[PDB]
């Protein structure tokens, strides 16, 4: 299948409570493989996946060094962003980052990512060309000018086409028994009366990996998007995910409804009914 590597970084200032916390979490698809938290008391005990341990201590040392420098860099960013928006030193603010690469089943680069949000709003992104920036406002234009002057996009491009793709391929090989295994959903339909007149049909999908899944209800073969309650896909804690979709149906009409399930681990899509 296709795969992604992505780092999700959060830097949050906290005036009067020390320096901004920096946490970076690395994923292959929906598997977290590394964390670096500036608030962790024991960086050595910070979790890494098993197929990371086999890479050895020099690999760990080089990553740890870059994470430590990234903590300082994101604190520099938060100081500058406060100034770009004329903000007081009293409030807490948040800078988020996502970066990494997507590859196809042959391991070739599909696209790269390097983008930022401030206080929950998109701020700047490296464009798909890996050469130009999109800035959201006049503050992000200041970042864009500085990064253009320093040729930052060329450094990001080299990481995204080189290091990111190369190490994602290595992780996929070392972790092939898990990272390259899609587990299909286990599916069933339940029935919950609400009155003499109506009942809920709930279509369940349990135990699947990766998290991407499509779950839909049809009535007489017509999609019921507006009338379907669809909960957010949620982690079970054993690597796998869960999701359900529910519709309210008139008593006696249950067999007109079909639940449809698509997922990478299924040889064929499922159609399910109550009973």
């Amino acid at each position: 299948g296709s795969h992604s590597m992505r780092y999700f970084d959060t830097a949050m200032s906290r005036p009067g409570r020390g320096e901004p916390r920096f946490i970076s979490v690395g994923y292959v698809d929906d598997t977290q493989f590394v964390r670096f938290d500036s608030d962790a008391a024991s960086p050595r005990e910070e979790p890494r996946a098993p197929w990371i341990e086999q890479e050895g201590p020099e690999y760990w040392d080089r990553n740890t060094q870059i994470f430590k420098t990234n903590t300082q860099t994101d604190r520099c960013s938060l100081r500058n962003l406060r100034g770009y928006y004329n903000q007081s030193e009293a409030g807490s603010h948040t800078l988020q980052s996502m970066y990494g690469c997507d590859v196809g089943p042959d391991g070739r680069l599909l696209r790269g990512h390097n983008q930022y949000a401030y206080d929950g709003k998109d701020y700047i992104a490296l464009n798909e060309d890996l050469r130009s920036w999109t800035a959201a406002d006049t503050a992000a234009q200041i970042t864009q000018r500085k990064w253009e002057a320093a040729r930052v996009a060329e450094q990001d491009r080299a990481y995204l086409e080189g290091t990111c793709v190369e190490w994602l391929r290595r992780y996929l090989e070392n972790g092939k028994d898990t990272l390259e295994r899609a587990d299909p959903p286990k599916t069933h339909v339940t029935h919950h009366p609400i009155s003499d007149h109506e009942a809920t049909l709930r279509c369940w999908a349990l135990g699947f990996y990766p998290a991407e899944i499509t779950l839909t209800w049809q009535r007489d073969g017509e999609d019921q998007t507006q009338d379907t309650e669809l909960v957010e896909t949620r982690p079970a804690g054993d690597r796998t995910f869960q999701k359900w979709a529910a519709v309210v149906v008139p008593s006696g009409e249950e067999q007109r409804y079909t639940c449809h399930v698509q997922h990478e681990g299924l040889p064929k899509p499922l159609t399910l009914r109550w009973e």
């Binding site: 780092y7 970084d9 970076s24 690395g26 590394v34 670096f36 990553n63 870059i66 994470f67 420098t69 990234n70 860099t73 994101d74 520099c76 960013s77 500058n80 962003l81 800078l95 980052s97 970066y99 390097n114 930022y116 701020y123 700047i124 970042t143 990064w147 320093a150 930052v152 450094q155 990001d156 990481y159 290091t163 990111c164 190490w167």
Partner: peptide, 8 residues
Amino acid sequence: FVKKKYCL
């Protein structure tokens, strides 16, 4: 593998 970041 982590990426070196740049100050905004």
